[PDB]
Amino acid sequence: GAYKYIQELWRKKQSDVMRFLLRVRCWQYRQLSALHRAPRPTRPDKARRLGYKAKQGYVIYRIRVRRGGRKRPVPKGATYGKPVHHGVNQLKFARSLQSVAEERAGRHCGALRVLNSYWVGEDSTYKFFEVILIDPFHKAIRRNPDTQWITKPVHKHREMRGLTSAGRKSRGLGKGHKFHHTIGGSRRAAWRRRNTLQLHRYR
Amino acid sequence: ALRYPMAVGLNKGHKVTKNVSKPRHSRRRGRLTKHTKFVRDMIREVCGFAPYERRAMELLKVSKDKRALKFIKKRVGTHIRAKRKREELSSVLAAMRKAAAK
Amino acid sequence: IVNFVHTNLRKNNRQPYAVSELAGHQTSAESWGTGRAVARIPRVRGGGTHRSGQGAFGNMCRGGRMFAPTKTWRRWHRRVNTTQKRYAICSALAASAL
Amino acid sequence: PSRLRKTRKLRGHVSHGHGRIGKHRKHPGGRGNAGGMHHHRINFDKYHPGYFGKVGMRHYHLKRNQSFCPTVNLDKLWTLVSEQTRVNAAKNKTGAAPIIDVVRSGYYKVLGKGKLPKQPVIVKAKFFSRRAEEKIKGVGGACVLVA
Amino acid sequence: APSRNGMILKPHFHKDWQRRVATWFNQPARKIRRRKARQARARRIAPRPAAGPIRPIVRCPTVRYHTKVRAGRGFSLEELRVAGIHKKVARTIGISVDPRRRNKSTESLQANVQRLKEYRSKLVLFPRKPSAPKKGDSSAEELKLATQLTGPVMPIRNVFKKEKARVITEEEKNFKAFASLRMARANARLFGIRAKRAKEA
RNA sequence: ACACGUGCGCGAGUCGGGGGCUACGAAAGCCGCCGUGGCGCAAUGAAGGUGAAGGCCGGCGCCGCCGGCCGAGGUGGGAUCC
RNA sequence: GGCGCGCCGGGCCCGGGUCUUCCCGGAGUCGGGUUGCUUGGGAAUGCAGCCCAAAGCGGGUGGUAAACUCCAUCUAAGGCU
RNA sequence: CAGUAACGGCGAGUGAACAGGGAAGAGCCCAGCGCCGAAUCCCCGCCCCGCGGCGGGGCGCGGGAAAUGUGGCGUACGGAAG
């Protein structure tokens, strides 16, 4: 199949073939608005993996996120605290720019529900991500029993809660020795158990 | 001259006869299949090389595969990875000493 | 042993009671300070009402909270040893015959 | 019982049993374990010697089951097996010794503290001390190793 | 401040702990809540075991506990295969499966094979239609003695073999058990530098 | 939470507190192949680790095996018994 | 509003075992450096920015940095519950 | 487990995890790789049951999505074909 050839060609991003396409498209993407609808997946291959079945109701928005970290919003760099919290410039936002992309695609398209996203280019100033959006109300999705999980009210705004694959990676969850601080539901759920007096009735 | 099974030492543990079990199918992931070899060999001919590979190649052509080792160890990541890269960049380079011979 | 076991296991069928956590502390009260010829109690912030400048926070203050408000994490239940529990019933049946 | 307490016998007094000169103030020594090297040094020197400083090697991921080796002495070795066996050992004619599987009862080492009564044993213990060996050999027994 | 000979003790109450006090007045209502659900489930899983499907004989890991035996997650795929049970059919007839469980021993393997052999003989299998007993079912007189198994099904018990008294042989008397352990310690530790100095020599 | 005193129970053990089984009663009663586990029963060392009486009479004026029986100290003061 | 007893409406023409020939995996992502936050995680537990940029007997983990060995242990960068 | 390993002007303080005993207990689906003539899907017209969860059966050189990949088989516990 062609998809395996597109898969391994997309791993040779330093090649003359892909450095032409990742640059000339990255030009084309700057000239477009910061959030616009793409008519198809830029990568038909990558969208296959992340769940994009090319049928009616499946949507792909190409949104760009302004590149760099996060500087602390304080007037004239003055945090009026202790020398630890004096920091502003070299600070980093907890979620990835791919997750910041999905939650603008999903916020703008509130009617739709965000599945996943994939990188399609980066410049000095911007990254570019195709975000896979689904209609929970198109009968193609609303009838297909293996894709009617998004159609239920539990999956409203996955992108906003870190349920999307890009969103999950900011939380620090997974199994084993490295992911103890989010054992239970999350980092918030771990913290609670550990800082709750189980004052038993008898004790 | 009979020993006992001891809980510490060079050959410690409890008596267990070992079953000849087939290794599980998850173990063989990343094994180089006949077809996926061809695809990476095919796309290599279509795409070419990364600039760091080509620079490392020109350090092997002057025959400096420590200054090439120290290069790739900065470029690709670790020592274990940079050694495998040096092994494989020298393998594609050996074929250029073959393919020009006849 | 009958007295000890009776007067610890009768604390176990006992429902919690507590004063509400916010009781007395549902005001924006603030002490007038070190003049004004009044006794430095956190006075209720200004208005055209009776409460304006009365006194809110304190066990002694009218309205107010109580001293050390009763918490529901009081140890209501006292556990007794099984052997001691048995040696209350053996003694209680024994006195019943007499 | 709030009625049995000292608080009830301090109604009618003034300071409530906390001094008239040095009043019951909030934290007049600092909170908790403060001034341990400054103004509470003498308490810490006299009663908690060794409190300040490091010693020995840090062991990061210590699991308490790798270093599990619960010990029984020879003093109470016979209590692991029923009193019937110790009775049936001496009286019978063969010279057969009963087996005390020390691992079955939940100990991994046999230390040799007690006087061991003069009748043979076979002890299937995981570890042994040097004395515990000599005592069982002296009474006339086996120190069988097991894992 | 410390008064005299006290314990240098550190309470963990420097946070806002009173907000997060978990009280246990739920407990007696919870024990009824769990119990009512346990009964209502048992009456639903109507002739089936109440405690659920069979769990395999499983050794506890780590040297502390490997003298004991548990109920596991589920049966290994080779424990089912040697027993002759299909891994998709196992779940339907009340057998716990987990694909994760390896088998390193024949002892634990053949024990859990013999476990499934005992289970299937104990099993009473109803027809899927009452008016049609199919080929892989049981007889009507053996179907009327079907009662819910109160407690865990084939409870896994921790028992040691009946060994008798022996006349102590002359190697058993003359086995230096302490010095054996102390030699083994050295023969584990130093071994690596003997094989290294055997390279040099 | 810790300490010490005192009362009770059991005692080298002890304790279900978490779970489970069967109006007052959200109580009480029960479990022991629910004692997991806690503390106690063993200490010391940074750790590798090690881990708690002997003398005698002999077989080869002795020395490590061979053997045999008796064997958990001594002094001083000691309420109580004799 | 559950729950099966009998008819009919249309769907569905399915298995299991051994044998041998073939098939088999998610990339600006792992990973590395560096920075900041973070954690009990200590020559960096986690998270993120920028830069470097993979492999296929490979890759990750194996609670002290690194080289050289064996071994053990899972299949990451997709989803539901 | 455990106020433990560890963190900390190694000061004040902070501080998990595994094992074990329980409550509950349930597993799974894709992409890829491939195979079958896109075998798949949404929608409009009429007839016909029919439902205050708009679904069922027809009937249409009726329209569209879709080879930039729909559907069936199949997912690391291996799988498929003969």
Curated annotation (Swiss-Prot), chain A:
It is found in: Cytoplasm. Transmembrane segments: none annotated. Residues 168-181 have a biased composition (Basic residues). Disulfide bonds: none annotated. One of its GO terms (biological process) is cytoplasmic translation. Gene3D superfamilies: Ribosomal protein l15e. The keyword Ubl conjugation applies. The modification Phosphoserine is found at residues 33, 96, 99. Component of the large ribosomal subunit. The ribosome is a large ribonucleoprotein complex responsible for the synthesis of proteins in the cell. This is Large ribosomal subunit protein eL15. It comes from Oryctolagus cuniculus (Rabbit).
UniProtKB/Swiss-Prot annotation, chain B:
One of its GO terms (biological process) is translation. Its main location: cytoplasm. It holds the Pfam family Ribosomal_L36e. Residues 8-30 are annotated as: Disordered. It is found in: Cytoplasm, Cytosol; Cytoplasm. Residues 12-30 have a biased composition (Basic residues). GO terms for cellular component: cytosol; ribonucleoprotein complex; ribosome. Keywords: Acetylation, Cytoplasm, Ribonucleoprotein, Ribosomal protein. InterPro entries: Ribosomal_eL36, Ribosomal_eL36_sf. Component of the large ribosomal subunit. Component of the large ribosomal subunit. The ribosome is a large ribonucleoprotein complex responsible for the synthesis of proteins in the cell. Belongs to the eukaryotic ribosomal protein eL36 family. This is Large ribosomal subunit protein eL36. The gene is RPL36.
From Swiss-Prot, chain C:
Belongs to the universal ribosomal protein uL4 family. This is Large ribosomal subunit protein uL4. The modification N6-acetyllysine is found at residue 71. The modification Omega-N-methylarginine is found at residue 62. Citrullinated by PADI4. Component of the large ribosomal subunit. The ribosome is a large ribonucleoprotein complex responsible for the synthesis of proteins in the cell. Component of the large ribosomal subunit. May bind IPO9 with low affinity. Interacts with RBM3. The chain holds residues 36 to 133 of 413 of the full protein. It is found in: Cytoplasm.
From Swiss-Prot, chain D:
HAMAP family: Ribosomal_uL15 (MF_01341). It comes from Oryctolagus cuniculus (Rabbit). Gene3D superfamilies: 3.100.10.10, 4.10.990.10. Its main location: cytoplasm. The modification Phosphoserine is found at residue 67. Residues 1-36 are annotated as: Disordered. GO terms for molecular function: structural constituent of ribosome. The gene is RPL27A. The modification N6-acetyllysine is found at residues 46, 54, 109. Component of the large ribosomal subunit. It is found in: Cytoplasm. Hydroxylated on His-38 by MINA. This is Large ribosomal subunit protein uL15.
